[PDB]
């Protein structure tokens, strides 16, 4: 319950149906602000910040504890348990999509549905598997993050947004710069050493995978791979927009998909 304040948990909206919104790298829960009004008349929406968000006291970031995504899963499950919520839908972006997958395997009855955005089970390439990055490529990135975080961040923000939407680049850059550089590097490293391919088949929750036209971190082939190997009923929704952060750059397009996906579960 101490976690509820530490991770800035907010519950808004009304009703029986609970929806958790879980953000990805470089933002906090405010990234959901524009799609949020489409959900709160019909749902009780739970928002929180990952421990690595700049909006969380850096005093709480335990490098050794958060060395794997299971620690993040522990936080999610602890929040839901403290709120006494036995059933929900879960919307996860990027690292939170991985967290959601792991959590649904841990507690199948708790997650009635998953919605995965900017999602991948593995961001590194492997033999015949296209994740998007070679080891050498991301190691070059990690070098840059470590040498000059500000310079790296300025370069990454428009790539992540993808589409030429200056306001989204500005907004993403804002929260990206709010992260402590060493925590930022650590979380990225944790994500890039994660590989969930082996356990996708264990998932039993129905799942919607949201695909954009181009994502610097998620090849177009990943969505079909997820659909093929996830063990529940999986549908790919195609979002007609470019980038990794459609909740920031194309909130109108995304919101309508979220509405359909969360109408019943």
Sum this structure up briefly:
This protein is α/β, with parallel strands linked by helices and 265 residues long.
CATH architecture: 3-Layer(aba) Sandwich
Instruction: Tell me about the largest β-sheet.
Output: 7 strands, mixed
The strand order across the widest sheet is: 1-3-2-4-5-6-7
The DSSP helix count reads 10
CATH classification class: Alpha Beta
Strand content: 5-15%
What name is given to the CATH topology?
Rossmann fold
> What is the SS-derived class?
alpha/beta
H-E string: HEEEHEHEHHHHEHEHH
Number of domains: 1
> What is the CATH H-level superfamily?
Alpha/Beta hydrolase fold, catalytic domain
Judging from the principal axes of the Cα atoms, what is the shape? globular
Helicity range: 25-40%
Subcellular location: Cytoplasm; Nucleus
Enzyme class: hydrolase
Protein name: Strigolactone esterase D14
GO molecular function: hydrolase activity
Please specify the SSE layout and strand pairing:
Elements: H1 2-6, E1 10-13, E2 18-22, E3 44-48, H2 69-82, E4 88-93, H3 95-106, E5 111-117, H4 135-147, H5 149-161, H6 166-176, H7 181-192, E6 207-211, H8 221-229, E7 234-238, H9 246-249, H10 251-261
Outline the structure in words.
It is classed as hydrolase. This protein is an alpha/beta fold and 265 residues long. The protein has a single domain (1-265), classed as 3-Layer(aba) Sandwich (Rossmann fold), CATH 3.40.50.1820. It is 39% helix and 14% strand. β4 (88-93), α3 (95-106) and β5 (111-117) form a beta-alpha-beta unit. The radius of gyration is 17 Å and the shape is globular. 42% of the residues are buried.
